[PDB]
Amino acid sequence: EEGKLVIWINGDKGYNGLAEVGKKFEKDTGIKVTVEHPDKLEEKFPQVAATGDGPDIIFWAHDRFGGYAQSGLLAEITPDKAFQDKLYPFTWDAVRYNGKLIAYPIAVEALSLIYNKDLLPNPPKTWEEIPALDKELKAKGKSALMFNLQEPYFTWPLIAADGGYAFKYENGKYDIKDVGVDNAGAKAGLTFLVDLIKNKHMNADTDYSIAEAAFNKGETAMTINGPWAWSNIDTSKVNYGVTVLPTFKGQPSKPFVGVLSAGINAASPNKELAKEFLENYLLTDEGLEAVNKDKPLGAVALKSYEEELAKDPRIAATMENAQKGEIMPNIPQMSAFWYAVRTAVINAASGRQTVDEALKDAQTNAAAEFDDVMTKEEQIFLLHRAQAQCEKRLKEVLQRRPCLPEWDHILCWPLGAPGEVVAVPCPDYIYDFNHKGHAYRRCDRNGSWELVPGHNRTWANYSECVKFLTNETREREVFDRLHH
Amino acid sequence: EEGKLVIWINGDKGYNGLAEVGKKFEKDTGIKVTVEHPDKLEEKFPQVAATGDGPDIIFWAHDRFGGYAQSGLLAEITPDKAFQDKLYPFTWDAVRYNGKLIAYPIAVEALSLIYNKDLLPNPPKTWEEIPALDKELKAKGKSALMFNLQEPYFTWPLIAADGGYAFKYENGKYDIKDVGVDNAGAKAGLTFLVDLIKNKHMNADTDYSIAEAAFNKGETAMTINGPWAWSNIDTSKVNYGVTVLPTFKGQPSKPFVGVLSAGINAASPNKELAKEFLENYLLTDEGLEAVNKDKPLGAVALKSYEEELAKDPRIAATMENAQKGEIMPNIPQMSAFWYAVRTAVINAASGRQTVDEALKDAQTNAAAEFDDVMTKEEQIFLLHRAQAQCEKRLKEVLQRRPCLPEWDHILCWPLGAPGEVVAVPCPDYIYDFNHKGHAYRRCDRNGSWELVPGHNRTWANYSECVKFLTNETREREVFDRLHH
Numbered sequence: 001e002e003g004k005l006v007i008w009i010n011g012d013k014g015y016n017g018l019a020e021v022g023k024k025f026e027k028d029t030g031i032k033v034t035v036e037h038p039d040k041l042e043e044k045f046p047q048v049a050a051t052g053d054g055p056d057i058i059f060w061a062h063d064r065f066g067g068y069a070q071s072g073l074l075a076e077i078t079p080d081k082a083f084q085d086k087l088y089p090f091t092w093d094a095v096r097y098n099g100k101l102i103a104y105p106i107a108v109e110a111l112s113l114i115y116n117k118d119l120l121p122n123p124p125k126t127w128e129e130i131p132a133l134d135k136e137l138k139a140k141g142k143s144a145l146m147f148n149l150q151e152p153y154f155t156w157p158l159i160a161a162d163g164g165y166a167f168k169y170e171n172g173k174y175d176i177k178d179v180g181v182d183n184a185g186a187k188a189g190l191t192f193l194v195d196l197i198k199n200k201h202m203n204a205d206t207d208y209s210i211a212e213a214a215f216n217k218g219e220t221a222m223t224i225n226g227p228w229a230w231s232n233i234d235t236s237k238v239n240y241g242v243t244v245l246p247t248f249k250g251q252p253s254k255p256f257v258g259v260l261s262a263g264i265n266a267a268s269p270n271k272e273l274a275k276e277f278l279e280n281y282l283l284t285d286e287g288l289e290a291v292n293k294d295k296p297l298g299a300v301a302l303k304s305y306e307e308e309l310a311k312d313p314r315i316a317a318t319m320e321n322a323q324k325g326e327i328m329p330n331i332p333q334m335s336a337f338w339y340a341v342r343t344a345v346i347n348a349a350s351g352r353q354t355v356d357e358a359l360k361d362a363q364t365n366a367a368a369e370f371d372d373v374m375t376k377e378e379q380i381f382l383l384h385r386a387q388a389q390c391e392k393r394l395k396e397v398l399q400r401r402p403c404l405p406e407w408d409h410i411l412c413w414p415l416g417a418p419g420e421v422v423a424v425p426c427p428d429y430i431y432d433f434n435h436k437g438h439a440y441r442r443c444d445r446n447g448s449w450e451l452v453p454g455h456n457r458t459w460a461n462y463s464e465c466v467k468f469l470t471n472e473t474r475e476r477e478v479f480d481r482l483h484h
Numbered sequence: 485e486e487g488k489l490v491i492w493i494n495g496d497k498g499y500n501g502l503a504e505v506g507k508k509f510e511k512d513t514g515i516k517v518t519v520e521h522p523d524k525l526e527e528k529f530p531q532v533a534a535t536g537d538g539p540d541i542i543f544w545a546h547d548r549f550g551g552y553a554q555s556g557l558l559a560e561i562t563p564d565k566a567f568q569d570k571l572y573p574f575t576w577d578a579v580r581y582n583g584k585l586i587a588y589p590i591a592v593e594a595l596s597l598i599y600n601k602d603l604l605p606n607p608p609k610t611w612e613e614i615p616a617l618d619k620e621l622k623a624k625g626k627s628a629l630m631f632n633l634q635e636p637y638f639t640w641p642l643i644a645a646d647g648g649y650a651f652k653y654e655n656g657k658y659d660i661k662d663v664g665v666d667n668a669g670a671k672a673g674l675t676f677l678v679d680l681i682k683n684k685h686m687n688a689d690t691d692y693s694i695a696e697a698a699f700n701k702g703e704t705a706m707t708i709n710g711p712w713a714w715s716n717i718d719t720s721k722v723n724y725g726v727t728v729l730p731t732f733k734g735q736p737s738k739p740f741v742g743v744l745s746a747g748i749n750a751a752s753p754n755k756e757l758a759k760e761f762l763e764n765y766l767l768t769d770e771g772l773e774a775v776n777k778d779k780p781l782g783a784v785a786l787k788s789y790e791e792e793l794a795k796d797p798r799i800a801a802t803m804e805n806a807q808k809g810e811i812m813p814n815i816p817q818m819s820a821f822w823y824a825v826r827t828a829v830i831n832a833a834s835g836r837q838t839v840d841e842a843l844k845d846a847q848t849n850a851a852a853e854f855d856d857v858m859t860k861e862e863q864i865f866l867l868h869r870a871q872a873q874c875e876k877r878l879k880e881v882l883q884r885r886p887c888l889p890e891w892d893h894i895l896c897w898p899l900g901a902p903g904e905v906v907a908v909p910c911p912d913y914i915y916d917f918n919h920k921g922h923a924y925r926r927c928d929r930n931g932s933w934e935l936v937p938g939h940n941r942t943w944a945n946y947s948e949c950v951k952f953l954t955n956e957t958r959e960r961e962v963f964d965r966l967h968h
C-alpha cells in the first residue's frame with residue numbers, strides 16, 4: 001500500500017523503540033509507520049514479500065539476505081558517499097553480496113556469557129569446569145547454566161570452539177561444498193554438550209523463554225544470550241556481568257557474528273520513503289538511542305553513536321566475543337546449514353541419534369554440490385580465455401588487403417574479405433547469447449573495419465546474438481510462478 | 485545529460501516541424517529540446533545509445549525496434565488507458581514486441597506510385613507495360629520511371645509481387661528459418677527489374693536524391709516514394725497524382741508497411757520528460773500538424789487527427805497500397821534480411837551475379853537457424869509437461885500418514901515423510917534455476933505440508949534454486965562489455 005510503511009522486525013528486539021522513531025517520521029512527513037513483529041518472520045518473508053502482505057522494510061541478521069537477494073526480493077540500496085562515511089566500513093562489508101549493497105547495517109550482535117554476580121562472583125574461564133560448578137549449585141537449589149538449546153545459534157559457540165566452521169572461506173569466496181560441521185573438533189563440542197544433558201546438568205527441552213525467565217528469577221547462575229536480552233535482566237534487578245565466553249579445550253568459543261540489517265522490499269512502491277526513513281530517522285544518534293533504550297542493539301554501525309556505547313563494559317565484552325567468533329556467511333546455502341544444524345543438535349541432545357551420526361547427516365545436508373549456474377566471475381574467465389585465443393590467432397596470421405582479426409571484448413573477428421559483410425557465429429562461450437545467431441561487421445574496400453557513422457567505434461551488429469529481453473521475459477515468468 | 489531532450493529522427497522526415505513542437509515544449513516546461521538528423525541513425529543507434537551520445541528519443545520504422553529491444557536499449561513505454569484510446573489499436577500492435585510495448589506509434593508509411601499528370605495523364609496498371617512507355621518517353625527526351633534502387637525498401641514491392649516474402653507468419657509468430665526471398669515469384673520480380681536495367685530503361689546507379697530531383701525537375705514521368713516526399717514535389721510545382729502501384733503478373737505489388745515509431749532510450753535519465761513530450765506535445769492534433777506540415781507523415785496513429793488526413797486523396801492511395809502490402813516483421817533477424825536483400829539487389833542489377841545466384845545467397849544469409857535461447861513460451865510448455873507428470877504421479881500414488889505429492893506451479897513434491905524436512909532437487913526443466921541446489925518443505929506430524937506462518941500458502945524454501953541476482957550480475961557484465 002502506497003504512501004505508508006510496514007516494518008517487520010524480530011520480537012526479541014526493540015520494536016517499541018522502533019515504533020517511536022516511526023511516530024517521529026509520521027509527525028514530520030505525514031506518513032504512517034507500522035512496526036510489526038511476526039513469529040518466524042525470517043521464513044515468512046520470502047513467500048509473502050512479493051504479495052503486498054510483505055513489509056516495506058525487513059530487519060534481520062545479514063545471513064538470510066543472501067538468499068533473499070538471490071530470490072530477487074530486496075531492492076539494492078543506493079546511499080551517497082556522505083552517508084556511507086557515517087557507518088563503519090566493516091558493517092558495510094557484511095551487507096554486501098555479489099558486489100551489490102542489499103541492506104543497511106544497523107548493529108553488530110554477538111553472544112556473550114551473562115552471569116549472576118551474586119550467585120557466582122567469578123565466571124568460569126573454561127567449559128570443562130561447569131559440570132563441577134553445577135553439581136555445587138544444585139545442592140543450593142540452583143543450576144549453573146541455562147540457555148536456548150533449540151536454536152543452533154546458541155549452541156554453535158561450543159560446536160565451533162575446537163575446530164568447527166560453517167563454510168570455508170578462501171580467496172574471497174565461500175566453498176559451499178566444504179563444511180566443517182562433522183570434523184574432529186565439532187564432535188568434541190557436541191559430545192561435550194550432550195554430556196551436560198546426559199549428566200542432568202541441563203535439560204534438553206530448554207528454549208529461549210524457559211532459560212531467560214530462569215535467569216531473571218535468579219534460578220540459574222549463567223546464561224548465554226545477546227545484547228537484546230539485557231533490558232529484561234535490568235527490570236528483574238539481577239546483579240549481572242557480561243563476560244567473554246568460556247574456553248573449550250583451551251580454545252575460545254567461536255560465536256557467529258550477526259550484523260542486524262535493514263532491507264527494502266523490491267516489491268514495495270515505497271522505496272524512496274524507505275530510504276528516507278532509514279537514512280535520516282533511524283541511523284541517527286536519536287533514532288538509534290530510541291531503539292537502544294527499548295532493547296540494546298549491541299555495537300551500532302553509526303560511528304558517532306558507537307563511540308558512546310563503546311564505553312559500556314557490556315558492549316566491550318560483546319566486542320571481545322565478536323573478535324573471537326566468525327562472521328556468518330551470507331550465502332544462500334545458509335538456510336540449509338541452519339536446518340541441518342538444528343536437526344543435528346536436537347537429535348543428539350534428545351537421543352534420537354549419537355553425536356557422530358547426527359553430525360555426519362548434518363554434513364551431508366548442509367553441504368551443497370557446486371552451483372551449476374554460471375557466475376559473472378566464471379563468465380569473465382571464459383572471456384579472457386577467448387581474448388587469449390584471439391591474441392593467438394592474430395599473432396599467427398601476422399607471422400606470415402583483408403581486414404585484420406581483432407577482439408572487441410566479446411568476439412574475435414576473423415580475416416575479413418574486403419568489401420564484404422562478415423558474419424561470425426555468436427560465440428558459444430557467452431552463456432547468455434543465442435549461439436545459433438550471427439554477429440555482423442562490414443569490412444570496407446581498403447581493409448579497415450567499417451566504423452559507426454561519424455564516430456570512432458567499430459560497427460558491429462549483435463542483434464541476433466543478444467537476448468536481453470527474452471531472458472527477462474522468461475526469468476520473470478519463473479518469479480511470478482514462485483510467488484503467485 | 486539530465487533536464488534536456490535529444491531527439492534523433494530521419495533526414496527525409498519532418499525534423500524542422502518536430503523542432504517546432506520541441507520549441508513549444510521548451511516554452512512550457514523550460515526544457516531544451518534538440519532535434520538531430522544523423523546519417524544512418526538506424527545503425528548508429530545501438531552502439532552510441534548507451535554512451536550518453538545517444539538520444540533520449542529515437543524515431544524510426546517499427547522493424548529495427550525488435551533488435552533494439554532485445555539489445556536492452558529501449559525503455560518500455562507505460563501509457564494509461566485514457567491515452568491508449570487515442571491511437572488506432574493496429575498501430576499499437578506494431579510497436580508491440582515479446583508482449584511489451586517498446587515505442588509510440590506515430591504514423592503509417594507505405595510506398596506509392598507518384599506520376600507526373602502532365603507527362604502521363606494515365607498511370608500504367610501493370611509493370612509489364614512500363615518498358616513500352618519508357619521507350620516512348622525516351623524519344624521525347626524523358627524517362628518513364630526513376631526510383632531509389634540502392635535501398636531494398638523500394639525494390640521490394642516488385643520482388644514481393646508474384647510470391648516473395650520476408651518471414652513466414654504462422655500461429656502468431658515469425659519463422660526465422662522460413663524465408664521467401666528465393667522462391668519462383670521473387671526471381672520473377674528481380675529478373676524483371678534487372679531487365680529494366682539491361683534494356684537501358686533505368687540506371688543501376690539511381691539513388692534517392694538522383695531519382696527525386698529527376699522527378700521534381702520534370703525529367704521523369706513516375707517515381708516510387710513515400711508520403712514524406714510529397715512536400716518537395718509541391719515546392720517544385722509539378723502536377724502530380726499519387727496512385728496504387730502497378731500490378732506484376734496480375735498480382736498487386738506488395739510494399740512493406742512501416743509504422744514510424746518513437747522509442748525512449750533505456751539509458752536516458754529523462755524517461756519521464758520523454759513520455760511527457762511524446763504523449764502531450766507530439767501525439768496531439770497540433771503537434772502532428774506541425775510535423776505533417778514540414779513533411780507528410782502518412783496516415784497518423786492519432787484517430788482524431790487521422791480522420792482529417794483521411795479525406796486527402798494522397799493518403800487514400802497510401803492506405804490502398806498499405807492494404808496490398810505486408811507489415812514489416814519487427815523481429816531481430818531483420819537487419820540480416822536487409823543486408824541480405826541489399827547485397828542481392830545491388831549485385832544482380834550491377835551484374836556481379838545472376839538473379840538466381842544473388843537470391844540463393846540472400847536466402848542463406850537472411851535465414852537464421854532457430855534461436856537456441858529458451859523463450860518464455862517454450863519454458864511454460866516444459867512447465868505444463870511437468871505439471872502433467874505430477875497429475876500422473878499423484879494419480880498413481882492414490883491408485884493404491886505421509887504428505888501427498890503436489891504441484892506448486894514449479895516443482896512436483898514427492899511423498900513426504902511425516903515430521904521431516906523434504907529436500908527436492910531444483911528441477912532441471914527450469915532453465916533459469918541452479919539445478920544442483922535443493923528446494924525444501926516441512927511435512928508436519930499429521931501429513932499436511934507445513935504452512936507459511938499465519939497464512940494459507942504452503943511453505944517452501946527455494947533459495948538454493950533461484951539465482952535471480954547472479955543471472956542479472958552476469959548478463960549485465962555482457963551488456964557493459966558490448967557497450968563500453
Ligand SMILES: OC[C@H]1O[C@H](O[C@H]2[C@H](O)[C@@H](O)[C@@H](O)O[C@@H]2CO)[C@H](O)[C@@H](O)[C@@H]1O
Pocket residue numbers: 010012042061062063064109151152153154226258338
Ligand atoms: O538459530 C538459527 C538462526 O540464527 C540466526 O538468528 C538469530 C538472530 O541473529 C539473533 O538476533 C537472535 O534473535 O537469535 C536468532 C536465533 O535464535 C540467523 O540469522 C537465522 O537465519 C537462523 O535461523
Ligand SMILES: OC[C@H]1O[C@H](O[C@H]2[C@H](O)[C@@H](O)[C@@H](O)O[C@@H]2CO)[C@H](O)[C@@H](O)[C@@H]1O
Pocket residue numbers: 494496526545546547548593635636637638710742822
Ligand atoms: O531499405 C532498407 C531499410 O528499409 C526501411 O527503412 C526505410 C524507412 O522505413 C522509410 O521511412 C524511408 O525513410 O526509407 C528507409 C530506407 O529507404 C527499414 O525500416 C530499415 O530497417 C531498412 O534499413
